[PDB]
Amino acid sequence: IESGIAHIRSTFNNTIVTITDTHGNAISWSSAGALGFRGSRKSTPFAAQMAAETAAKGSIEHGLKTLEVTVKGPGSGREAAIRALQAAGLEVTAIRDVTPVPHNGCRPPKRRRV
């Protein structure tokens, strides 16, 4: 294929990037822990850059070239992963900043120091 959508989910531990096909069929996937970083280094935006690089390498086989990147999850590695999809040979056209916002929904687990 030529076109797909890049789902980045960056949460406070991990930044998982799956480059999928438009009606949701994953070409290749790699996480920050898949690259090898096990500790807190999973949270650094360099691992998100590396994960976007590995997902870009995996996506260009049977292939695809022009992405459409959907940012999900509250984290840090969104900007480096969008930039690293560009520098790894792909094009990033649209940027959907879609973290799942509940309106009121379920109640969160308790705050931590209490």
Partner: protein
């Protein structure tokens, strides 16, 4: 179909019954591997199936006659250079033919296993093909044996060689062969599971035995009271004596139930796993400087190995010496330690006590007892020094065998004990890890890390040296290469600096953008664009 069958095969020598009640099968192209402790008939079994040795009991039936026997130490092996398919093996592995006696130990098994593979064989009875091999030859073995005519039966001592090159395993154990098909990695998964089943069932019958003996003792201590506290009041003396009989009839019924369930159970206590404890001391107060080999040159007529290879190693460090096939590994230690065309200078400490280990097993005062061999001065010098060190470090009640009528998977162990008993403060291990066992080389892998320095560890393994390496001597073309790291690809000046600096500044700009995405608006964008383009420009050159 099968080709060779075994039934209740045993063997008797002057230690004890090595081997008993052995039931196994060789088939049409099985890759069968012997594992087992050394000295456990690992290669006596091969001489039984070869009919090289006649078994005391048991019937060994075979069908096809061709039995290729490739053993350890075939000791001035012949130079019948015939049936030239051997020379294909003798020239893939890069081994010259010209001699036998001046060859290193590394080449001679590759020149014996060569003649063994190609006489003609539908059945291979080979002892240990994985001693002194480099990985380009160790990998060549598996491509031989996968692309091979028939069945292979090997005694490996390798978890490495059997993950690729095994279909069955004939594990030798406590005097009994047991076979398991499929792999070696899942084989120990199978053994640990059967050990858990037998340990749970022995723990259950031992617990039940203690329970029924306790509830039998409580009834006895009641029957004694109930017999002694009768004849006092209320009812004559046989209404109360019958109650003692009523308890004492149960006290025997439960014992008969106990003995019957134990004769049906027959669940033995689990034999323990094998440990060595082995360790080391070498705690002598030592100086600093040990070995200065300057301007060395070694040649064999026109065969030139060393030329102007200047290296200097002092005390207290792990020196791994790696040669892929014939780098002179064995030759350097001889020309470190000796004369005979060490051309140049080899200076060594005069007061250092260099304890030497050989590759070749040809330095024994043969037909001597280990009693007379090992220096055992008075009383506990046999026990607390020596016999504990043997039995604890793999020996049976084998205090006096002739030491190469021994097992030959010992006699590396004899050298080893003679070193490590006495704290010699300098060791050089010219290929130790190949004759030893997966419980034997492991503890030498461990304690040599806790060893107090000055080690010269030649090892064709890649995983043994990961515990015993700080610096390397990679023998190569035109002499040595004293490495202190990987030292490949000639670590550079301009391009490496540009790459690391541009990547670190790139991660600076990326983290500065990604920490706060909407603030200090847009200098970071020009920064990252120019830095990424310049990184591509530097990597493009």
């Amino acid at each position: 179909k099968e080709i060779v069958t075994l039934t209740n095969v045993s063997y008797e020598v002057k230690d004890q019954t090595v081997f008993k009640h052995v039931n196994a099968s060789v088939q049409q192209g099985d890759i069968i591997g012997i594992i087992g402790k050394n000295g456990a008939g690992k290669s006596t079994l091969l001489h039984l199936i070869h009919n090289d040795l006649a078994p005391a009991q048991g019937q060994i039936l075979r069908k096809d006659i061709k039995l290729a026997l490739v053993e350890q130490e075939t000791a001035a092996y012949s130079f019948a250079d015939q049936t030239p398919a051997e020379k294909k093996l003798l020239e893939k592995w890069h081994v010259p033919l010209r001699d036998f006696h001046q060859l290193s130990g590394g080449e001679k098994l590759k020149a014996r296993l060569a003649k063994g593979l190609s006489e003609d064989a539908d059945l291979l009875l080979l002892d240990q093909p994985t001693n002194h091999l480099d990985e380009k030859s160790l990998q060549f073995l598996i491509q031989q044996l996968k692309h091979y005519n028939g069945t292979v039966i090997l005694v490996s001592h390798d978890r490495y060689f059997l993950d690729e090159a095994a279909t069955k395993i004939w594990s030798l154990e406590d005097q009994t062969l047991i076979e398991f098909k499929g792999n070696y990695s899942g084989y120990m998964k199978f053994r640990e599971k059967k050990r858990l089943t037998q340990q749970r069932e022995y723990e259950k019958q031992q617990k039940m035995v203690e329970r029924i003996e306790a509830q039998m003792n409580g009834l006895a201590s009641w029957s004694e009271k109930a017999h002694a506290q009768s004849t006092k009041k209320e009812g004559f003396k046989e209404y109360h004596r019958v109650k003692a009989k009523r308890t004492d009839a149960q006290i025997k019924s439960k014992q008969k139930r106990l003995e019957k369930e134990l004769e049906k159970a027959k669940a033995e206590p689990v034999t323990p796993e094998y440990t060595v404890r082995f360790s080391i001391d070498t705690t002598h107060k030592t100086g600093k400087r040990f070995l200065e080999v300057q301007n060395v040159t070694k040649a064999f007529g026109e065969r030139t190995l060393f030329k102007n290879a200047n290296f200097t190693i002092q005390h207290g460090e792990k020196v791994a010496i790696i040669g892929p096939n014939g780098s002179g590994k064995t030759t350097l230690l001889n020309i470190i330690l000796g004369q005979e065309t060490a051309e140049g200078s080899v200076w060594v400490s005069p007061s250092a006590n260099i304890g030497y280990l050989t590759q070749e097993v040809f330095d024994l005062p043969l037909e001597q007892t280990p009693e007379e061999l090992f220096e055992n001065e008075t009383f506990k010098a046999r026990g607390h020094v020596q016999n504990l060190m043997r039995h604890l470090g793999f020996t049976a009640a084998q205090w006096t065998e002739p030491i190469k009528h021994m097992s030959m998977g010992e006699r590396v162990k004899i050298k080893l004990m003679a070193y490590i008993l006495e704290e010699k403060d300098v060791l050089i291990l010219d290929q130790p890890t190949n004759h030893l066992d997966l419980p034997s080389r492991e503890q030498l892998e461990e304690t040599l890390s806790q060893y107090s320095g000055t080690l010269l560890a030649v090892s064709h393994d890649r995983y043994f040296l990961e515990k015993t390496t700080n610096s390397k001597l990679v023998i190569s073309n035109n002499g040595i290469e004293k490495q202190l790291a990987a030292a490949a690809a000639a670590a550079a000046a301009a391009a490496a600096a540009a790459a690391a600096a541009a990547a670190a500044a790139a991660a600076a700009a990326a983290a500065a953008a990604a920490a706060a995405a909407a603030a200090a608006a847009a200098a970071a964008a020009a920064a990252a664009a120019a830095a990424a383009a310049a990184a591509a420009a530097a990597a493009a050159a």
